[PDB]
Swiss-Prot record, chain A:
GTPase involved in nucleocytoplasmic transport, participating both to the import and the export from the nucleus of proteins and RNAs. Switches between a cytoplasmic GDP- and a nuclear GTP-bound state by nucleotide exchange and GTP hydrolysis. Nuclear import receptors such as importin beta bind their substrates only in the absence of GTP-bound RAN and release them upon direct interaction with GTP-bound RAN, while export receptors behave in the opposite way. Changing residue 17 to A: Minor effect on the interaction with the alpha phosphate group of bound GTP. Keywords: Acetylation, Cell cycle, Cell division, Cytoplasm, GTP-binding, Host-virus interaction, Hydrolase, Isopeptide bond, Magnesium, Metal-binding, Mitosis, Nucleotide-binding, Nucleus, Phosphoprotein, Protein transport, Transport, Ubl conjugation. Changing residue 16 to N: Has low binding affinity for GTP and GDP. Decreases nuclear import of proteins and RNA. Stabilizes the interaction with RCC1. No effect on nuclear location during interphase. This is GTP-binding nuclear protein Ran. The lineage of its organism: Eukaryota, Metazoa, Chordata, Craniata, Vertebrata.
From Swiss-Prot, chain B:
Belongs to the exportin family. This is Exportin-1. Receptor for the leucine-rich nuclear export signal (NES). Present with 7080 molecules/cell in log phase SD medium. PANTHER family: EXPORTIN 1/5, EXPORTIN-1. One of its GO terms (molecular function) is U1 snRNA binding. Interacts with GSP1/GSP2, polyadenylate-binding protein PAB1 and PRP40. GO terms for biological process: mRNA export from nucleus; nuclear export; protein export from nucleus; protein localization to kinetochore; ribosomal large subunit export from nucleus; ribosomal small subunit export from nucleus; tRNA export from nucleus; tRNA re-export from nucleus. InterPro entries: ARM-like (IPR011989), ARM-type_fold (IPR016024), CRM1_repeat (IPR041123), Exp1_repeat_2 (IPR041235), Exportin-1/Importin-b-like (IPR013598), Importin-beta_N (IPR001494), XPO1/5 (IPR045065), XPO1_C_dom (IPR014877). Pfam families: CRM1_C (PF08767), CRM1_repeat (PF18777), CRM1_repeat_2 (PF18784), CRM1_repeat_3 (PF18787), IBN_N (PF03810), Xpo1 (PF08389). SUPFAM superfamilies: ARM repeat. Keywords: Cytoplasm, Nucleus, Phosphoprotein, Protein transport, Transport. GO terms for cellular component: cytoplasm; kinetochore; nucleus; perinuclear region of cytoplasm; spindle pole body.
From Swiss-Prot, chain C:
Belongs to the RANBP1 family. The keyword DNA-binding does not apply. It comes from the Eukaryota. The lineage of its organism: Eukaryota, Fungi, Dikarya, Ascomycota, Saccharomycotina. The chain holds residues 80 to 200 of 201 of the full protein. This is Ran-specific GTPase-activating protein 1. Interacts with GSP1 and PRP20. Keywords: Cytoplasm, GTPase activation, Nucleus, Phosphoprotein, Protein transport, Transport.
Amino acid sequence: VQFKLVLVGDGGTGKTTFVKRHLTGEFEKKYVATLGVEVHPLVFHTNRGPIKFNVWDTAGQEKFGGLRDGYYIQAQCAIIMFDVTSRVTYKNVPNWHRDLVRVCENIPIVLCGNKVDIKDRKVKAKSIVFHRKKNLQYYDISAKSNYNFEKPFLWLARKLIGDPNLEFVAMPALAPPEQYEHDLEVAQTTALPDEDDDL
Amino acid sequence: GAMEGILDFSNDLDIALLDQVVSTFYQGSGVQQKQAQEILTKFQDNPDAWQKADQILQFSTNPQSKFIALSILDKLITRKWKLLPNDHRIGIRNFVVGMIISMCQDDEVFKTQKNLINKSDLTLVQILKQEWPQNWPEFIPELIGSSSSSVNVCENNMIVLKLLSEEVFDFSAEQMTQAKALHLKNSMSKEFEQIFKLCFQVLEQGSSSLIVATLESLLRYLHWIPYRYIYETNILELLSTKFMTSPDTRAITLKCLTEVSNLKIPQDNDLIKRQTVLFFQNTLQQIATSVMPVTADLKATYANANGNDQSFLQDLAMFLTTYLARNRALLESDESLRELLLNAHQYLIQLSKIEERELFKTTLDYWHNLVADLFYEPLKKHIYEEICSQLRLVIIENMVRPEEVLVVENDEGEIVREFVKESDTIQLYKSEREVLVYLTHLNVIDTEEIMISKLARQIDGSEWSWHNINTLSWAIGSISGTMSEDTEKRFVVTVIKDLLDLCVKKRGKDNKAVVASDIMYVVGQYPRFLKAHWNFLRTVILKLFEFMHETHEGVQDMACDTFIKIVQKCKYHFVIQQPRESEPFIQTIIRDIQKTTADLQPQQVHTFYKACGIIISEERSVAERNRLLSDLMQLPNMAWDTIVEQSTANPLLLDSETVKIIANIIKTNVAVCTSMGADFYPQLGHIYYNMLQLYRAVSSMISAQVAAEGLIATKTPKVRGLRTIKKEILKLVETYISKARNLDDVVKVLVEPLLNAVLEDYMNNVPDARDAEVLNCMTTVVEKVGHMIPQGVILILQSVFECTLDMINKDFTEYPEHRVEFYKLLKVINEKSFAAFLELPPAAFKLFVDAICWAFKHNNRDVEVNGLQIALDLVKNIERMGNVPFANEFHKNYFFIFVSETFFVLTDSDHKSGFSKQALLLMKLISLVYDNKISVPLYQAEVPQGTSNQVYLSQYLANMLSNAFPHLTSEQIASFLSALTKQCKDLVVFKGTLRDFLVQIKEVGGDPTDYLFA
Amino acid sequence: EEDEEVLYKVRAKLFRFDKDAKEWKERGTGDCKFLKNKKTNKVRILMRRDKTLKICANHIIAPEYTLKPNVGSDRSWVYACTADIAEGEAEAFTFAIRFGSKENADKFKEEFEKAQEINKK
Ligand SMILES: *[C@H](CC(=O)O)C[C@@H](O)/C=C/C(C)=C\[C@H](C)C/C(C)=C/C=C/[C@@H](O)[C@H]1C[C@@H](O)[C@H](C)[C@H](/C=C/C)O1
Ligand SMILES: Nc1nc2c(ncn2[C@@H]2O[C@H](COP(=O)(O)OP(=O)(O)NP(=O)(O)O)[C@@H](O)[C@H]2O)c(=O)[nH]1
Ligand SMILES: [Cl-]
Ligand SMILES: [Cl-]
Ligand SMILES: [Cl-]
Ligand SMILES: [Mg+2]
């Protein structure tokens, strides 16, 4: 049915932005620091049925850390996030992993290097090796471009359900049913974001 | 509500209510969970909450409540331990120790509350970090003794010891001063003989959960212990035999053995070499007999993902690669060891067939290590000839799609243009290519035979698939350079004959797309061949031109990329007149450029034009080259001329079609300028005057639009289109100037009209209408000719400095491009034309200092780094002036501003990325005073007259730190500053001292003698 | 969706307007299809996100809807939807939908309006 997922990593690495993208489809440009933790349910439809992740999106800023490792209690899986444009965030990966596995001794964990859409990459592909001895899955991702955005959830689902051929599927779409002026005019006259994007 | 009651410390703690709040948080959902979370965080953060810890541990029925109690204690121990009265310290130690003992002796608790016991153990370790051994000398002997009284206690003691080793050896560098880390490492080292004794005895006397815990501890010890503990005892036999047999112990044993393989070990000792061979031999024998034979299909096993098979196969890969990279020479000379060597490598071959990208990278790294060694070390390659032959097959069959191959199969089985770049396979391709290149050199006959026969089975249809032709084609392309020119010739001819057959035989847009992409990849990969076979090269190019009319957008785009890829390498053959041709091929291309590019998108047209510029720059005779350039630019120059008439008569608002035409003309110029560089000048000069006039006209259009429609006008397709014209004009000028060789013309002809056209327009537009590209263009201008235009640089500063600063000094995020370009501009001005800043009025020079410090405070690396560099360069610029009034006043006004601002970002924990450059700057500043390089007093009789700046500096800093960090003792501050000032000529030591200060400010009672570390 | 004919398909990015914040928020990128029900002849928009395949638009192309320009774009339409069920219970939204090109946006409008006539039959 459902699994507790903890999401950890340095402040500003894109944890919340990544979750939001999955929740609503949106890309939040602003950086509003998470305070302690935010819990969101997130459901995926698979060939093996629905899987629900209760996502505990934790604060990466030390000053907003709240219960810190207290959030990890009974997690069944995890994502460790860093930012490929910020070397300090990769340097801190072993610290996050240390704190996490001290509480969660045998869970599937994905390591994600976020923000690969940014041209000036700083954490070189070749350098990313921490996951190997720790048996973490690794993916380059971008919450902004959606590059590999589904990969961490697909992998975790396969591990959790115990089926390596599990796939996301389209669920059948139910037949839909059969001041306006002012609200529309406001929407018409607020520019769409990123008009230089391919889509 | 009810839950907030635990926050009222004036009343007794209702433990039941606490357990309800905790349960609501962990087991609840929605608003109630959210409220409960905030309450617990507030409770946790209460600086007296630790006083409740004992009560919670005693009375709670909720293990998560007790975890939280322990987190509360952890925070107290790590940050405020030495603030506590001595009886609170003794009491806390007693109840943590007691809780642990109590939980271990109850089998039910020990079995079911592992998380809580691990948390308790970690909390005990935090107390050890503070108290041990100086105020707890018998901890280890008593731990060892207590281990005999209970299997539970003994197992838990192994957990405690594992955590201590980690905290001391693996995670101390960031968390402890250099001196304290040394103390704890020395202390653990001195008692390790007895820790090991206990470890080895448990391991000898075989309880599985206890054994696993002991082995987990051993894994940590292996990070630092001397090798004699491993080689002078019987522990290697146990690890490589006994503990490999049971699956529960096998996982950890294998990781231990991997670390054993990394021990520091004498190189000249035959007995030790024998031992290193023996454990490997033992381990491989266990794998073969107890896990799987070398023939086993590990690909299949991994894909099944039963139990812990995936992690085990990963750890096996790590073990084999680690050992063999270090030790395979031990196995290479002795005939009796050959079978082991090859079986080990055969397992690796099997592991390399697993479908798991990251695991493949690990094994590929090993193969690279091997083949690079075989390439050089005499008499070795023959040993591995069969391994290498199998490896050739593996790599060829798993070649990732090259960056150049733009077509991919969609989920519906259609061959389509990729939506985006596969950015995460770039490194993978390079690594695969690297290994395959070595393998080709090692046996060119085998490689050719493999490729030519695989290709033959695509053609005859026996093995045909998109996947198969693709991996093969990519492989064939990737080995370009390995064969002799002569051997390559025959090989390429054979491959192309076959691929052309395949192209005739496999029809439909999908097949045609796949095969076209593969042939384009291959031909683009063999320029040496193209250069030697003009008739073939000409035929390839004409075929590419055909594809420029393809309705398949992926093929079409790839044709353009391949054209330029080929031209970049073969351009010389396009500029000469080839035997049996009437004209150089460049003439043929240019003559028919309208037809060839008719179906291309504008950006593809620009690429085509860019490729033509590459060719034309091969012509070194100026007359002939300028003629070719003129011919190339004929179409855009004719379109330009007609637009310059339609502007000359008007100016009114350009329609969107005209705006697009103009943008594309300029983009075409940019493209050609990019490849021709300094050679582009005659074309630039041809359009320049009218181009700057057009810049002004479009500028007035933009302004008029913002005036009539509001700021929202800047979002419209029309205004965005007009700004594109301005941006491309700026890009064209920047591109040219960045490559110009005639700087006299740049200054005399280009600069004055540019500045006249761009500067006032930037200054006098509203913020949202200002192009950051103006700043970028000016940076190149200053970089290339700044030394020659001192008044020009002044004008640039006057025009953009204050107004841009005001855009970016309200927060860290608005106008991100302006922000980044702004600081690049100031950097180059400070570097090349410092006199420009000397000329500023004092009020403006103050804004400059403010701007630099503002840069410091960014977390944005693109701003922070430049800010620090400017600060450093500025200090050097001032110092270079010597004892003159400007420098004296500079120091009087700003020395302490730079010192304190630098200290601030060093110490606030929000600018850790800039540590190295902050330290550098601080060291420079301190060394200025330490070297008496500041001529005037930095103080005003605020101190005795004649007081040295050294003395005043210490006083200022001690006061500054005393007020900013009141929890530090005066001696801590005094000792820190003494060390720091003494060390201002030795950056590595100076930084160590800064790092020690950063540790000490996070706690109370840090030892001042720590700053004596050396 | 086997009881449905695909009248039209196009790659698109869908936005929804958050009134409270004054901003457009992306809802999904993927194939926007116009589907005609073979039993009822009614034409809906159905759009699914790439990769996750999650529904980001599911609504009838009501005859009363009108496609309007967005001030920032020549390749987008904005319109009010009274009943979208992508997320579950029917809900009103102001949508914007952007395409790879103006040509695509103009084709979409043409097809959108054809679909509206069908829904009037
Ligand atoms: C599909 C079939 C076709 O012939 O069009 C091919 C299509 O998918 C793409 C072809 C591409 C991108 C390049 C071709 C290699 C260009 C051609 C057709 C070159 C032909 C050259 C012949 O003169 C060639 C025949 C062979 O005997 C060899 C290669 C000789 C070389 C002599 C030095 O010449
Ligand atoms: N360029 C780019 N920016 C991204 C990406 N993902 C997130 N961001 C940006 O990075 C910033 C921080 O994102 P956020 O999700 O708040 O980070 P966080 O890891 O949750 N921070 P905290 O741990 O403090 O709550 C935001 O401005 C966001 O838009 C990405 O993939 N690419
Ligand atoms: Cl617990
Ligand atoms: Cl050449
Ligand atoms: Cl003191
Ligand atoms: Mg966050």
